[PDB]
Every structure is written in C-alpha cells, then in structure tokens.
C-alpha cells in the first residue's frame, strides 16, 4: 500500500538500437554499447533474409 | 551468525554480571582482542588484493575491454581505501583502550552502552550525541 506508479513495460529503459539486441540481460554493459554502435553500421546485403 | 564482527574473533557476546563494575580488566582485554582480530583480518585482505592486482595487470589491445578490466579495479580499490580509512580509526580506538579511557562519550561524560560497543567497537560518542552530530554534519555539508 505505498506504490504510486509502475513501469509501463520492460523495454522503456533502452533505445531502439539497443532494444534490437537479443539477450541484453546476459551481456556486459560495455559490450552492449559496442554492439549497438557497430550494428547501426551494417550495410544492406544483396538478398535480405 | 558467522558474519558479524564478533565472528571474526572466536568470542561470543559478553554478559555483564549482576554486581559487575563497568570497566574491568576482562572487558578491556575482550575489546582489545576484538579489535586486534578485526585489524589483522583487514590487513590480510589488503595483502590478498595486492597479490591479485599484481598478477592480473596486463596491456590489453582493445580499448573496450581495458575499460572492462579497469572498472572492477576501481571498485576494489574503493573498498580497500575505505577499509584503510577505518584502520586509522581502529588504531585510535586501540590507543584509547591501551590508555584505559575507553567506553565513554567524548561530548558528554555519559558512558556508552556495553551492547553498543559490542555492536560497533569503534564508537566514539553516545547514540544521542552521534545522531545530533550526524544531523549537524549533513546539514552543514549539503
Ligand atoms: N569497511 C568499513 N569502512 C568504514 C567503516 N566505518 C567507517 N569506515 C570508513 O572510514 C571513514 C571514517 O568514517 P567517520 O569519519 O569516522 O564517520 P563515522 O563516525 O560515521 O564512522 C568512513 O567515511 P565515509 O564517509 O563513510 O566513507 P565514504 O562514504 O566517503 O565512502 C568510511 O569510509 C566500517 O565500519 N567499515
Ligand atoms: Zn554524548
């Protein structure tokens, strides 16, 4: 009988780029950072899968 | 429970006898034993830390894992610094015990409870003065 509010959903902490990485819960913060940074640099291949 | 400060030494909580005077030889010896054990433990922990630090340190070729290996060291050194700051307090308390001027508040002459001294053996003030001083401190700081 004291909680005034509650998080809307789990994903609200992180941006879209980081939100796309699976199993963030098991990754060190630094490697998540580097992961997102490089993931945004991917080049479109010939046939998307 | 083997996790408190009386656990470090093999001593169990004291028990003031009915007609027991306040500061007797036995209590002072008790507290000296407690403090000595606590200290020796802290210093052995420092030795552990240093051996670890001396073994691990290496030159990493990736800048995002050198930070990883130097972000746990910062916390470790933080804890070690804090305990080093407490080693001076323990030293001073050991000086008061050897001088036989231990167990009383420095502000008012009231004696500090035995159970509080078995709680935090480095206590310098009584609970009342401690609380008032902590408030004055936190207020003058922020
Ligand atoms: N491991 C350990 N360290 C202790 C303990 N008690 C005090 N210290 C460390 O020694 C410092 C000295 O504290 P005091 O100035 O005597 O304040 P106090 O009377 O409340 O203990 C503390 O400052 P501090 O401001 O609390 O440090 P910090 O908060 O800036 O990190 C703390 O860092 C303890 O019981 N265990
Ligand atoms: Zn007092």
Curated annotation (Swiss-Prot), chain A:
Effect upon mutating residue 18 to E: Resistant to antibiotics salinamide A and B
Biotech use, per record: Co-administration of salinamide and rifampicin or salinamide and myxopyronin suppresses the emergence of resistance to both antibiotics.
Effect of residue 33 to M: Resistant to antibiotics salinamide A and B
Family, as annotated: Belongs to the RNA polymerase beta chain family.
Purpose: DNA-dependent RNA polymerase (RNAP) catalyzes the transcription of DNA into RNA using the four ribonucleoside triphosphates as substrates. Resistance to the antibiotics salinamide A, salinamide B, rifampicin, streptolydigin, CBR703, myxopyronin, and lipiarmycin can result from mutations in this protein.
Subunit structure: The RNAP catalytic core consists of 2 alpha, 1 beta, 1 beta' and 1 omega subunit. When a sigma factor is associated with the core the holoenzyme is formed, which can initiate transcription. The rRNA transcription and antitermination complex (rrnTAC) consists of RNAP, NusA, NusB, NusE (rpsJ), NusG, SubB, ribosomal protein S4, DNA and precursor rRNA; S4 is more flexible than other subunits. In pull-down experiments interacts with CedA. (Microbial infection) Interacts (via flap domain) with Escherichia phage lambda antitermination protein Q; this interaction renders bacterial RNAP resistant to transcription pausing and allows it to read through termination signals.
Protein's recorded name: DNA-directed RNA polymerase subunit beta
Curated annotation (Swiss-Prot), chain B:
Coiled-coil positions: 24-45
Subunit composition and interactions: Interacts directly with the RNA polymerase.
A Pfam family matched in the record: zf-dskA_traR
Keywords associated with the record: Coiled coil, Cytoplasm, Metal-binding, Zinc, Zinc-finger
Protein name: RNA polymerase-binding transcription factor DksA
BP GO annotations: double-strand break repair; regulation of DNA-templated transcription
Zinc fingers, dksA C4-type class: 105-129
Note: Dosage-dependent suppressor of a dnaK deletion mutation. It suppressed not only the temperature-sensitive growth but also the filamentous phenotype of the dnaK deletion strain, while the defect of lambda growth is not suppressed.
Classification via NCBIfam families: dksA, PRK10778.1
Source organism, top-level taxon: Bacteria
Gene knockout outcome: Deletion blocks induction of rpoS by ppGpp, but does not alter relA expression, ppGpp regulation or RNA control during the stringent response. Increased expression of ectopic dksA, 2-fold decreased expression of CsrA, 10-fold decreased expression of sRNAs CsrB and CsrC.
Organism expressing this protein natively: Escherichia coli (strain K12)
Cystine pairs: none
An example Gene Ontology molecular-function term: guanosine tetraphosphate binding
Cellular location(s): Cytoplasm
GO CC annotation, single: cytoplasm
Physiological role: Transcription factor that acts by binding directly to the RNA polymerase (RNAP). Required for negative regulation of rRNA expression and positive regulation of several amino acid biosynthesis promoters. Also required for regulation of fis expression. Binding to RNAP disrupts interaction of RNAP with DNA, inhibits formation of initiation complexes, and amplifies effects of ppGpp and the initiating NTP on rRNA transcription. Inhibits transcript elongation, exonucleolytic RNA cleavage and pyrophosphorolysis, and increases intrinsic termination.
Upregulation: Expression levels are constant during exponential and stationary phase (at protein level). Negatively regulates its own transcription, translationally activated by CsrA.
Family as reported in the entry's similarity comment: Belongs to the DksA family.
Keyword Ligase attached: no
């Amino acid at each position: 009988d004291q909680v005034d509010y509650m998080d809307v959903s789990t994903q609200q902490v992180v941006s879209v780029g980081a939100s796309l990485i699976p199993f963030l819960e098991h990754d060190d913060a630094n490697r998540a950072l580097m992961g997102a940074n490089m993931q945004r640099q991917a080049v479109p291949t010939l046939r998307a899968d | 429970s083997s996790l408190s400060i009386l656990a470090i030494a093999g001593v169990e909580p004291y028990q003031e006898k009915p007609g027991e005077e306040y500061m007797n030889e036995a209590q002072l010896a008790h507290f000296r034993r407690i403090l000595e054990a606590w200290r020796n433990q802290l210093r052995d922990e420092v030795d552990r830390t240093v051996t670890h630090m001396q073994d691990e340190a290496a030159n990493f070729p990736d800048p995002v894992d050198r930070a990883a290996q130097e972000e746990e060291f910062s916390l470790e050194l933080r804890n070690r610094d804090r305990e080093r700051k407490l080693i001076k307090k323990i030293e001073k308390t050991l000086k008061k015990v050897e001088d036989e001027d231990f167990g009383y508040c420095e502000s008012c002459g009231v004696e500090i409870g035995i159970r509080r001294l078995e709680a935090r053996p480095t206590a310098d003030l009584c609970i009342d003065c401690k609380t008032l001083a902590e408030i004055r401190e936190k207020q003058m700081a922020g």
